[PDB]
């Protein structure tokens, strides 16, 4: 869809994921796994309470008989009430429609932007392969691992000891 | 005829209001009420058609 990502470039998901919406794998001499990034993903939940919220308040707002002597009058009663069923069931069905779009967009958007993130962050220190995995031209441990995720990571340390090998 | 009869009881109503009289006069043909029916709670409700009943 719309960002790219998923479905994009990331080309699939992973089962292997079980605690947030989207986060990181890594692998290392130290381990390998995956990690859920779990600030966007309930923000993200966030935004879809108030989303769907926003749904019902927005639409949370008897019969009546007459006489053969009264089909006008009864006929637009009639039209009248089916005229709004018609309307407030248009107006549901296509509401439910558009943000589900906007809702699928929504996560290719959030995606995008980490992986953004986490690209803007690593910078030339790493190769960027293109499938959503970089890989890196230093040795990155646990809590340089951390460091990406938690938004800290450090370029000049790792700086021209990427270099060196990034060019022999 | 319907129910043996062909004579007819045509009947009407009124809402009286508070400490309104009412007057009734008749030479005859009068069907006239014994009873009358004070609103003794007001509000939301409806009529529901069903061949049902309540469980
Ligand atoms: C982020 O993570 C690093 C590595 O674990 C840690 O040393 C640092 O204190 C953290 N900083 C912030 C601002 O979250
Ligand atoms: C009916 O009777 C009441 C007695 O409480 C009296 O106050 C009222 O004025 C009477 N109404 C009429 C129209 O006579």
Redo the contacts with the bound molecule.
């Keep these: 869809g719309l960002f790219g990502a998923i479905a994009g470039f990331i080309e699939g998901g992973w089962q292997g994921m079980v605690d947030g919406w989207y986060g990181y794998h890594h692998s290392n001499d130290q381990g390998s796994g995956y990690a859920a990034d779990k600030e966007s993903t309930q923000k993200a939940f966030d935004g879809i309470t108030n989303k769907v919220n926003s749904v019902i308040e927005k639409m949370n707002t008897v019969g009546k008989e007459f006489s053969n002597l009264e089909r006008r009058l009864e006929n637009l009663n009639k039209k009248m009430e089916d005229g709004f069923l018609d309307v407030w069931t248009y107006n549901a069905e296509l509401l439910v429609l558009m943000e589900n779009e906007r809702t699928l967009d929504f996560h290719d958007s959030n995606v995008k932007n980490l992986y953004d993130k986490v690209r803007m962050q690593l910078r030339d220190n790493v190769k960027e392969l293109g499938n959503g995995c970089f890989e890196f031209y230093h040795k990155c441990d646990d809590?340089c691992m951390?460091?990406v995720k938690?938004?800290?990571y450090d370029y000049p340390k790792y700086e021209e000891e990427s270099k060196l090998n990034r060019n022999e | 005829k319907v129910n043996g009869q062909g004579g007819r009881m045509e009947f009407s109503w009124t809402l009286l209001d508070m400490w309104d009289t009412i007057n009734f006069e008749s030479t005859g043909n009068l069907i006239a009420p014994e009873y009358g029916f004070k609103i003794s709670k007001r509000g939301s409700s409806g009529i529901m058609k069903t061949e049902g009943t309540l469980e």
């Design positions: 809590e951390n460091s938690n938004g800290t």
